[PDB]
Amino acid sequence: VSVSEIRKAQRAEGPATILAIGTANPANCVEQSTYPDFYFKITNSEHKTELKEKFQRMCDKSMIKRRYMYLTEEILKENPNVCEYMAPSLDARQDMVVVEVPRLGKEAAVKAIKEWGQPKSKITHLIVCTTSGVDMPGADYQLTKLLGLRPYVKRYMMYQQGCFAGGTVLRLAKDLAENNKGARVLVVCSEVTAVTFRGPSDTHLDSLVGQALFGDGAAALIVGSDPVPEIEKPIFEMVWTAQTIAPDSEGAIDGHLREAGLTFHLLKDVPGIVSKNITKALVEAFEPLGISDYNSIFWIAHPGGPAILDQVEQKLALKPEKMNATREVLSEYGNMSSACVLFILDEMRKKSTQNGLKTTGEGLEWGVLFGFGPGLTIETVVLRSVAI
Template structure:
């Protein structure tokens, strides 16, 4: 496994700026602030993101000495994965895994989990060996720290005193201790102990939309509130060795990576101080018909196991058209190429099917595909990475709005259930982002 060449390289952080928020049923502006939106990759540039340093390396600022985040090259990952899991003798399965990785559209991913960690915890390299205690000990320590880094960048770009934060929403697929990551972040960030906390566990990939929907509800019902949203995800719980009868495990091992994203959402931005990026207009959640068991996750003594059915791309693509019709019907929008699209990067097959089903132009999902390529699937953190990349690229390319020059857009996440979160967004003039 390759190490990130840049010293002090952070594992995929997102620091978004501020965003103006929604309109409620009365047309009142509900401001959603996205602070902190910086993507940190191997090149330090997430499509316009400024270069920045963070953790990793000897004596890093997280107190974890001599640990370094691994920057994983997707081409060489199959050789590493089969070697570290003592599976090189499974030649046919290895050839299959190489093909999966080649078709994944991923160039690299970032992982806290290193060869050193795996050698110290050999059961994590097996498919069904007890390892939950070791995994939970690590995620309980590392997931809050990764979330803290994203939150700090968000608060810094927001530019307001952290004492103005009134609510905290935290999402992670791992780390189920009590008190949870939300409690840890209050202390790590030095937030007011009276901040109202919401902790979301075990939601999976659709939760990047869920946190925005919940923050929207808070903003609409709590005048003057500012909600800090943090999604922090690591694959420490989901890394497993091989089982020749469970091929869906191979797909998961080829897709997932670490990442954390943070955003601040609120209503009524302070003029000349809080510069919105997008408005949240509406939000919805739905369960897709006949999809039970299509995506499942089970937390057991072996860690968190994921199970994916082959028909996931077709189930999503067959339903996405009606979902968009329901979301944009009130606006009279039926041309999906006239809106910007932020889709959870669940994998190339899903994106390809959605693109065909909706008749999208080739570049319509370019921001999603870029994040998938540079970071892999970071579960709930992914869609905020895409949102950040889009607004930065829109400014750099001289487009008129943060939504690639378009006025309206959609953000949707999908995951276990199958559950789909759909948010209608309204972009902001890029002249307001400088």
């Protein structure tokens, strides 16, 4: 037997392509304007007057209008442990998210599969990504069962990844699709803040920042190489990827999964680190392609908070409009961790089509997607848009 012949026949020929995008969120919509009042009340912390004032400034500057949350007043009233800053509560939190992560991911996946339009029996690979909870068999098994995928779908269960992992799943799906003829990858990012929610403490102000920014959501993609002309419909193509660890960033974003749930720390200036290192990321990605005008490409940036976006825009002299799609997702959903960047791709291609632009990438040809998270890690994905 010829392994050379097997290899040539086994592999795909064209670039990995996003062929569908679907999203979902918990039904509970929580307004940001009044969240400090809600949160200081539900956590029994109304006596902490200056801390609450601080939180209201964090929420007012967050540029978030609303977030969708699995957690409700009723669930929180049944779980005082979760409402404390640091109380034993992982078992209760796990019980929530081992069910809600695949439930929410299913909703997003059904929408992506409907848009794709092909039989779900043609899904060959499944990537599931979450930072909320872990279990064995994982959320990947659960979504296989919930969706009725083939039992021999090839699964990639990405746990405890953090906010950069919307880029990670794309980087992974690219190789799965491109190296395997006919492969169709279902990608699901599903993030639920019930493992990180906790009450406020005035010696842990970084923890408080997470309470102002993180919200819930799932996004699903279909990714494949060699799309079938006029049966499947390309939305974006992936061309190149990178992942790197920024220098001088040790401990900038840390999270520990403990008996009290998932903790969150920020020990460094994350917006400054991102903005000091983003140019190197762009020249690695775009100098080989001959492009150096970063306003000439379309942008997707993980909105870890608005300060990251503001400082990158300032560093690079981006026109304010470059970040429009990103900021619209931050505004209507908050920081959904790994899923966020995928919601921004959906926003971008939907507005570009609805408004009669020439490409799904705001009428531009090349684009970039960035994930930012623990490490400090930067994920880069170079994208090409599709005409109309």
